[PDB]
Amino acid sequence: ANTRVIELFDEFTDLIRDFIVRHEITTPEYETIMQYMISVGEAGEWPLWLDAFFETTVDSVSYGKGNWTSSAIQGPFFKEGAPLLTGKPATLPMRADEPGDRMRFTGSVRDTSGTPITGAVIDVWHSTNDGNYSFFSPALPDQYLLRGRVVPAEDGSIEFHSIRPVPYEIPKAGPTGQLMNSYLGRHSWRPAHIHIRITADGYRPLITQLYFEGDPYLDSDSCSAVKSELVLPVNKIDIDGETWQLVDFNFILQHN
Amino acid sequence: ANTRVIELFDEFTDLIRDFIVRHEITTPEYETIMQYMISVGEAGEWPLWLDAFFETTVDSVSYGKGNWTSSAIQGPFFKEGAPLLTGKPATLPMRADEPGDRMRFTGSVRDTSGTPITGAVIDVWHSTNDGNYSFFSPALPDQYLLRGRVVPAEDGSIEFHSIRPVPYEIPKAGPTGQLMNSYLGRHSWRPAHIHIRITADGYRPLITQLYFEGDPYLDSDSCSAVKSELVLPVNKIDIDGETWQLVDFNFILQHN
Ligand SMILES: [Fe+3]
Ligand SMILES: [Fe+3]
């Protein structure tokens, strides 16, 4: 037996019991909740659901602000063992004629002392323009698509190419989408974001997200996950008769 | 109900986040909760889990005490369309030599004033000596056994014969059982009971349970479903060879 489980679970049951009483939850309402919970399980949506509403809060208490990069939620759509990307301009694996604007990402990884962290590896994943993640949609293959690991240069600089992510919506038709859209009368949209994980021997891992200035949902995240210090200027500076979105970010990691 | 799910959900959301913050639920803890929630779904256990922990409460909101017969939790094991019995001794359907002590039940269905409610139909269901309900066990036929419907005599009184229900265990190896037995370090035993549902034209439906004096689990019910007003004096008679156990209860109902 776990005293953690005992202390937390006994309190949690008193809490929910008080809620039931306080709000006068009826037998039908209880059945609806019982049935709704079941359908989340049947839709495979527990990760998506809990992350949509609560991962922000678990994120808030776990990691702090300071002179390092702020973390943000991981969400449910991360995947391990993404391919190391090297070459000319290192580029995220992409379908032929992947919809979207070519995006060029630059920046660095350093420590709270300004030292470049050459040991780091940066996982990056993001949605297709369709608002889908590889491995997590029936409309996409279970293959590393718009996912990959990127490594800094000896000087600490990083650089990759992809399509610029655009906003997306949690399936309106799933139990999560239903709750957010019908039942609550809100939306199920997230602002556009690049997910990031950086790990380096000696440093605390960083899981974070990079957002874009002017994004329509910047102040309306259905998942409650945006943070001002992770909102990025976008530049557009043509390369031979081709317009590129330019995004730059310098990551600072904490020791230990 | 758009407006009503908005109130409860937002309130629920604040409740859980506040819980997450105060107890500082970590990423690993959160992932464990998430895994457990999936567990319960992959078993057929949401109804069993919710009824075990929270139906006691939904119950005490739906009915409330008085000179009524005090209600009780239904549980996940009720079956609609049980057989209407009219034998002269009047017996629940059971297999030949159904193990366990024989039991005779008597009582009444009167209203508050004491006028017998002739239009009553009473569903009664309970476990085998082995701790299984028909329809909910491979060791039992998917047929009505220890399940039945009884109609009162025109003076109110009711009688049926059966076997004595005994304390049963919610399965040790299930996510719920695991929670009750392993992580919480308690037990998953319910005290002995007979389930009862009463319907009457122009009267409020009553769902409840009858327990037995002396039961080892009367004060440690795994489902917190016991009410002292609903535990029965049990007179133990030995009609040689076969030891009958006689019980009596007078059901009072509310009415529109
Ligand atoms: Fe995302
Ligand atoms: Fe039972």
Q: Which residues contact A229 (CB under 8 A, 6 or more apart)?
A: A70
Domain boundaries along the sequence of chain A: 1-256
Q: Are B192 and B167 in contact (CB under 8 A)?
A: yes
Strands A147-150 and A121-125, bridge-based pairing:
antiparallel
The whole-angstrom separation of Cα B84 and Cα B70 is 25
Whether A168 has a binding-site annotation, put simply, is yes
For residue B26, give the nearest of A5, A41, A62 by CB distance: A62
C-alpha torsion sign, points B71, B73, B77, B78 = positive
Collapsed DSSP state (helix, strand, coil) of residue A142: coil
Method underlying the structure: X-ray
Distance CA(A132)–CA(A163), nearest Å, equals 13
Q: Alpha helices, DSSP H only, in A24-149?
A: 27-42, 46-53, 55-62
Question: Which residue do the tokens 């990551």 mark?
Answer: A251
**3-state SS assignment for residue B249:** strand
What are the CB-based long-range contacts (under 8 Å, 24+) for B184-189?
B184/A1, B184/A5, B184/A6, B184/A9, B185/A1, B185/A6, B186/B220, B186/B222, B187/B220, B187/B222, B188/B222, B189/B217, B189/B220, B189/B222
Are A145 and A128 in contact, with CB atoms under 8 Å apart?
Answer: yes
How many angstroms does the Cα of residue B120 sit away from the middle of ligand 2?
22
**Is domain A1-256 classified as CATH 2.60.130.10?**
yes
Q: How far is the CA of A101 from the centre of ligand 1 (A)?
A: 18
Residues 6+ apart with CB under 8 A from B166: B100, B127, B129, B131, B192
Ligand nearest to the CA of A170: 1
Question: CA of B187: which chain A residue's CA is closest?
Answer: A1
Do the chains contact at A15 and B15, CB–CB below 8 Å?
A: yes
Compare CB distances from A58 to B25, B40, B179 and report the shortest one's residue. Answer: B25
Of B12, B25, B53, the CB nearest to A19: B12
Tell me the count of A-B CB pairs closer than 8 A: 119
- The answer to whether the beta carbons of residues A149 and A83 sit under 8 Å apart is yes
Residue B210, min C-alpha distance to chain A (Å): 21
Instruction: Please answer whether residues B105 and B160 qualify as being in contact, where contact means their C-beta atoms are separated by less than 8 angstroms.
Output: yes
